[PDB]
């Protein structure tokens, strides 16, 4: 019993973290085989960050401008290239701690663990969701760019996020490991704003299922709703529409609990319209949306790696 925001074990990722310095600008890199991947704005000075032309800026650099330290050993850079918003620095030594890995691009509403790093060293790990507006609500200070988000499946690390920047509302934006930004954001210190966010409905439902699995049932009721009626309520409360694909994804949870998805939707509709009347669900006074259905299965099933 119990249900917590649970991150993946980080050890496989810790052994891939290095530090990348270019001038007086330092951040983190990910060392896989003989390549270090890192945000391209490591090549920027402070005056460069308003309207950089990264092609020009990179042309002006050479291998010897990149100081890459794996703990105490300096890795010599023998090649550099830019892929969208990441740099790929070729080093002369393959990481002997490279795990089985994949680069994936995740969808909004999916979760991942972040190993937050400074100067190539881990500070801590925590679980994030990709918001519908393509930001993440992380915990990142200056120097944390190049920290990565990831999922584990069996023995394969799936890297899905590399941290680049913070938007003015305090939320965070980044790329996949091919350097494509999630969302309509750019790595330049210009006036940018996250679009209006929404709540991840399928995840709230998953978490309501987690609550039931852990013995919290006070919010259940005898009613059902149709998918269309539920989505008229969802739209009113700034929740994402629930699709039939989402209903199917909740299948393991509806199976385990015996509560049909559209029956849980009637509970959620009542919670939205009426509130919680001073009660809590899984220790929370708010409806939690950063657990996916798989996240619930993983935790409540004991999936390991």
């Amino acid at each position: 019993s119990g249900f917590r925001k649970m991150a993946f074990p980080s050890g496989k990722v810790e052994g891939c973290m290095v530090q990348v310095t270019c001038g007086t600008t330092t951040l983190n890199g990910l060392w896989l085989d003989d390549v270090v991947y890192c945000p391209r704005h490591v090549i920027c000075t402070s005056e460069d960050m308003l309207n950089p032309n990264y092609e020009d800026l990179l042309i002006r650099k050479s291998n010897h401008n990149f100081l890459v330290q794996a703990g105490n050993v300096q890795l010599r850079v023998i090649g550099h290239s830019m892929q969208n918003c990441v740099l790929k620095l070729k080093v002369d030594t393959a990481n002997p701690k490279t795990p089985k890995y994949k680069f994936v691009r995740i969808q909004p509403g999916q979760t991942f663990s972040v190993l937050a790093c400074y100067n190539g060293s881990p500070s801590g790990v925590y679980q994030c969701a990709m918001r519908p507006n393509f930001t993440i609500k992380g915990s990142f200070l200056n120097g944390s760019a190049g920290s990565v988000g990831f999922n584990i499946d069996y023995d394969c690390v799936s890297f899905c996020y590399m941290h680049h920047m913070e938007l003015p509302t305090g939320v965070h934006a980044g790329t996949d490991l091919e350097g494509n930004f999630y969302g309509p954001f750019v790595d330049r210190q210009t006036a940018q704003a996250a679009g209006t966010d929404t709540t991840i409905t399928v995840n709230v439902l998953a978490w309501l299922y987690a609550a039931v699995i852990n013995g919290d049932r006070w919010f259940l009721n005898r009613f059902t709703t149709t998918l269309n009626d539920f989505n008229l309520v969802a739209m009113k409360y700034n929740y994402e529409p629930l699709t039939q694909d989402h209903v199917d994804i909740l299948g393991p949870l509806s199976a385990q609990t015996g509560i049909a998805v559209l029956d849980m939707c009637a509970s959620l509709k009542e919670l939205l319209q009426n509130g919680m009347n001073g009660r809590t669900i899984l220790g929370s006074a708010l409806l939690e949306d950063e657990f996916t259905p798989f996240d619930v299965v993983r935790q409540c099933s004991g999936v390991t790696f």
């Binding site: 945000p39 200070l141 200056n142 760019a145 920047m165 913070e166 003015p168 210190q189 210009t190 006036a191």
Partner: peptide, 6 residues
């Protein structure tokens, strides 16, 4: 406020 590169 502008974006901040970290």
């Amino acid at each position: 406020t502008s974006a901040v590169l970290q």
